[model samples]
Target: LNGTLMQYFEWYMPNDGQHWKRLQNDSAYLAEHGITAVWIPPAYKGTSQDDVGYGAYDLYDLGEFHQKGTVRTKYGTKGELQSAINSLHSRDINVYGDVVINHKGGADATEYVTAVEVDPADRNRVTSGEQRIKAWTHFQFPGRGSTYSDFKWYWYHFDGTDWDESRKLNRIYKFQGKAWDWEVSNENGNYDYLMYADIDYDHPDVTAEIKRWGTWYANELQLDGFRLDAVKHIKFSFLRDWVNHVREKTGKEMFTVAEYWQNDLGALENYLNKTNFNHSVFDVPLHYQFHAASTQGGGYDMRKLLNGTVVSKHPVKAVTFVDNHDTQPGQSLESTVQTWFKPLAYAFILTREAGYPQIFYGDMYGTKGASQREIPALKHKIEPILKARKQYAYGAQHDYFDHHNIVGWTREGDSSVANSGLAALITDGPGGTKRMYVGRQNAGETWHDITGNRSDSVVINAEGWGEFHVNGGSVSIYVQR
Candidate 1:
């Protein structure tokens, strides 16, 4: 039941429309490496074929129509995506579709609307009186003319826009008589208007359209779950209801996780409480802790690894990871963990009993494009640890998080599962041996480091205490020899 998940796509992945085929071909490798689920990027049509999938344009256009200047949506055609999902499902691996609904981009036309300029710092403060402006808020989806649904979006469907065609100015123009959606993040006073034309979720038409799209998306791809995007900027109540509606429509218990993008445990806790814990959220605080530890080296406290983390508080609803597309260099949230500590961070997540772990595509396979040339892939460095997790990361756990520079834990072997126990040790500073208890089930058993970081084998004594050794600024997973 302890399954590992992987974010299958990175931001800078090649724009060539072959990603679906690649995923189809790699399904075997993913299942073989203990990945139980794969979270792919947004599959719908964005601004164009080469769009990174975040500039979401047409929700219904999943490479099936002649929209966005191409039939395929960065990844590939609809047939290719179906095959990829089929391949993953064939291997008993769950596929989670990336769903972005915070705002809409790639508008087809600009309409004249009365809007008021708001202060950039505090959106609640108005800077200019009611003024007429041309805002890009119309999306007719002319390319896919009423094939699936003929719902035309107009200026009244959104709450705000930034561009004014008549004046040649660019600033936030909150539509007159449209208030910012409540229950969003407090950042920038009101986070309802993140980018592009912000959807007015309070409107019944907008709510109905999203529900219709969610159901269509699930039924089209037969996705096992959803990876909600930019949830902190969206309405919390709307998200809560949307997931419920999708689950009811599909008649399957969707394994959903959201990207709240906040590093505070309290913020995540508030979201979870508001959403009634209906779905899990990415453990942003844990990633921040890893980044802090990686940058500070030995000065960071190793015992605080799980402190102030989503998993530490709400374990079942925490999706833990070390990095992601946003954390990759040159991205908006570019707080990448130092390369060397990634393994340690991964070890902490993958081999732990607390949260569901996720492996990032950038860290596992490296990144492409000119800006990401230096970020090396960690497949070689990470394979053995994945193997270790599959075989030994199970059963009850013991914590040795007392040290400031070094920490260790062990999983008591499951009586019904063979070789299901492991001893883990990680050090941010110079390493040493941890005399941790591995359970007295086997009086005297020989264990070895699977990562090949150390040559000596640890002999578990009659008391089930073994001195596990780790290298300086590294990690070691001790398993039964």
Candidate 2:
């Protein structure tokens, strides 16, 4: 509950096979910086060497098979990946693998199958009668035949596909007798189907195969947890059952988090209830709030920062973050929280007592070579905030969200750790000062801005009140110097 997470990969990183070694080298440094867990990208084989892992050509082939026109994935060979994991483990850092079970691509062959057209807006609405067409649903893993799993996927295992060779066009075609799965998010009419060959969780055989794969993957990688991809598009009941089944089979305390991409707080709350609160989900609503505040400048109400956010209500089940791989520039969910407000955003997540905060690697180490909208590394600005979190961001908290342009909070020092107290203040409009409490125990002590945004000191009075100050459009973390 006290650990912080970091997404260790970006979407556009080079396909060079040296990332594993780089991570191994950076393990100690990351541990020293208070990163307790690292969420690595998908380690399985994709459609090609450069396929960002989402294509999901083969679940068993972790860059070890000579399939999809390559023997090694974008990262490296399976051996190198394991070495990186071991290195991280040596430094007491837990590894969380990215699990993409929604659909798969790069089929080995094509076959004719009976299907019926469904409306794109509403997948449940059939638009055409049943017809026979060719599809890329035949997957015979020739590179590693039954090496780890003998289970082969066929057209019958899938619910539908977007492409049919006979027509050579893209369309929503539901399988002959299959129906869209139930208990899924009601986005885009029925969001049970996403991309590629949509998986049919309703099929008993498909569910059994997924369960078996979960067990084998967990045991094989010894992952501390999983980052389930596209939960909103998958069957909700099946997801809950899948998580329980994996934990029961492996007898491991797998910390799970899902990417249920929805900006609506009510939808997220409903999803959590449906899943029986089986696992945590990314605090997407909170992130959007941050983005809006950042872009809106001084007009945004500081008091409403936590309003409509999942973390405000379900703190323990929220993984708060500012930006991630999908939200970075040019991505589908692109809404880069403005650069000037990033530190404030980071301070909001890292120093707070609610959700488990996650740091994006791209934010820490610049995405220079990745894309045209590159983000310069904020390591210099973020390191101190991380240090403050590890040291002073503990104990009881008090909030001061009284003004529209400014807001602040304080943490009473914990006796277990020396100097474990801090006061954080931020402003989106004009520079101002506010009297905030730093705990009675810290009376008569002097505090200074650890972020260096304010070049001054404030002395706490006997009443534990100090006038904490911050500049316009910036954040300051006052710690005992």
Candidate 3:
């Protein structure tokens, strides 16, 4: 349960002075609060006004960099970036950068995506001399074919949408319930939900380019990790290979976490199982729990958050966070840290064994309503958790237990010498019915509140050794041994 934080770009673009200052302050603030890593938003040059990051103008321009009123965009400039990066390093904090691959930022000119244009002679490009391609979907597969053409005009194949008969030069197609004649190339749109030029990753060139691109980026950036976007759309085979390739090329093992948007445990579990052997994904399960407990009528549930399994069949590097950028304020289960049970949620996240823990950098300052104020508060709140996790050693078998209301776990330097441990977190449900014993493993132990020895460690039968009271909506850590 290492401490980390993420900065979202939408509202914090370096174009505003307020945004820039927040970053500078956050750099210093988060370090003091216990955060050891700060995940920055996509610092690449991106599309202006209309497209968000999807309409990337170029990967190098530093979008909104100059607009941030001080040669920096929402956060700051390249020099300032180096300074911020340096600042975090000075504090021994790592940085995770975000990237998109579900689609490339659209080109300003209307030209075919060169990534998909196959070279007839290149074996990677073509399978047969004829139009027969190697794609599993072949642009049209039964049941799954006639997939909603992101390029829009191809919709007729799906629902028989009307096309402009008189438009001879264009392959015009329409979709059910749409009024305009959409060109076939524009059919790949997610409408407004997701705006970007989707790349046909099934194309060999696209796959090669992405693998090369990811590896190259890692080398150049000295990046500690990557937060992959739109992972569901790409083939799992490609993703697994890409993660391995990049790790090999970089000569360092970096964090590779993917976003697989799914609500059901079955689907989410499948994605985890699919990527688990080689790569790590976010803990969508705990994320939902965090969000559910943070609302007005929201209440914490320790049992629901943990299913008693710490490690996935995949590797142990699963990454966990409270909230992320793409999510709307309320819909995001973990993004807003200032909400109810935040400390409790964070305590669970930090004490857990499965994934790298990430703190939402933007929410600390209360950005739920005003985006500009988000970064400061996050910096202030998360730093302490980071310090505690690193100093106390959260890497051990988590001793977990629960009841109707209270839920909590303990982390040790080792399971054998657990009682003298210094770190433990507990959270209770609405009525404060949760109860548990806190003591050393197989030892005649003395129990007391780790925060303040206000109560004596009253011994009991070996079945229930010692009892401690935990309050609802609060997360507190105890140091034993």
Candidate 4:
């Protein structure tokens, strides 16, 4: 039986500290809906209690210390997070933590360090000579001093800072003795500087400290896996070693995925090669194609859906997703697939034989904006597809990508599973009937669209060919009744 991985949080979730509690309560529903693993939001303390975990301030203070203006993080208290994890584990659902190890934010204080201004367009070229700048590259962790590990972060632990507090100037500053990690993404000449104090992976202490934190975090929470954030900016070697270190320390087959955030398939392939394929990465190209289908409307060619996707090349190591917190409507990388086409996108990922599919929480439960607008719930539309994937997407898959606007596939039922065969049809231009073969074994069987996009049922002929139908710009999954 195929299982779905769900991203259980959104960028616009209310900052009321009820997320962990909500997740704990929602565990049963998630398990029932064929969700095997959940990618939870970062649970650590960011710049402040209300700050999202991306602005991570303390790795040790996971809503456990009162350093970040409050004890509980944006999600909930450390105990609440643990309880949620326990609930998930009890339901046989794995929890994947969002590991934001690229940089540290909300430093405890500022330190005067010798740094050189660099071009924002290209971080490699030095724009200014050596100058002492006030950089916020110090972390005392006074609130929970020596509780989890007495590693006091200092300026030396980082490679550079963007803001010079002394001059109140905003510019990329590469520390005098430090250079941007050569093994990172080549975007903007060097993508090593993403935001805030960039961690110096070259430094021995930096490597050891992160490794120590990885072990501590995993062992402490009994985490089943991790979702490495901003991996494109992190050093390739450091990531490889760090992942190895974590796996060695915990001795658990921690399923790992990273956000390289590159739409280019070649770049993603290169990243996998560089990291030695330690973990899978999100199918950013496929997500973009979905977005194009929604916005381009009838102009999109359904046959090219999987053309340059990571899943098309590296199916085993590609985490296919429709939308994420970063790609949600109001976020920075806003390339959200339209609501009308989400079911189609989900159908493509879930019902297919390739790609490790992931469902977004916002798409499932709907999203409440940060006071702008609301995304209506698509759970009614997605649940049927989820069911079809869990039950019918098995064994041999017969693809029918003959048309530019319409495409469909049928999964031949396996003897191991009862009533497992199904046919799926999708289109972007208009509604039409597509003759697809479910399987020769299921001849004369009655089938109906589980998504209710089409009301009519077709009987499989003696040859196991059933003419499936779909509505205009929609998706329909036909399962044996």
| Residue 272, model 1: Cα distance from true site in angstroms | 0.6
- Tens digit of lDDT per residue, candidate 4, span 141-165? 8788999798998999899988999
Mind giving the per-residue lDDT tens digits that candidate 1 earns over 3-110?
A: 999999888888789999999999999999999999999999999888889889999998998886899999999999999999999999999999999889989999
Candidate 4 stretches greater than 4 Å from native: 371-373
Clashing pairs in 1: none
Q: What is the lDDT of candidate 2?
A: 0.89
Report the number of the highest-lDDT candidate. 1
How good is model 1 by TM-score?
A: 0.98
Which 10-residue window in model 3 sums to the lowest lDDT?
132-141
Residue-level lDDT of model 3, residues 1-481, one tens digit each, is 3455454344433344344345555676666656766666665544443233433333443432322112333334445555566667777777666666654432332321111122222212322222211211112112122222122112221211111222222221222232221111121332111323344444555567667767655654567777776666555666777888888888776766776665445555565666655656676656665666565343444466655222233226456766666543533432444454565666666655556676654444444434442423443344445555655544444455555455566554445333334334455444342234433452344444444413435343365334445555555555442
Rank by lDDT (best first): 1, 4, 2, 3
Better candidate number, 2 or 3, judged by TM-score? 2
lDDT of 2 by residue, 121-174 (tens): 888889999898888899999998999999899999899999998989799889
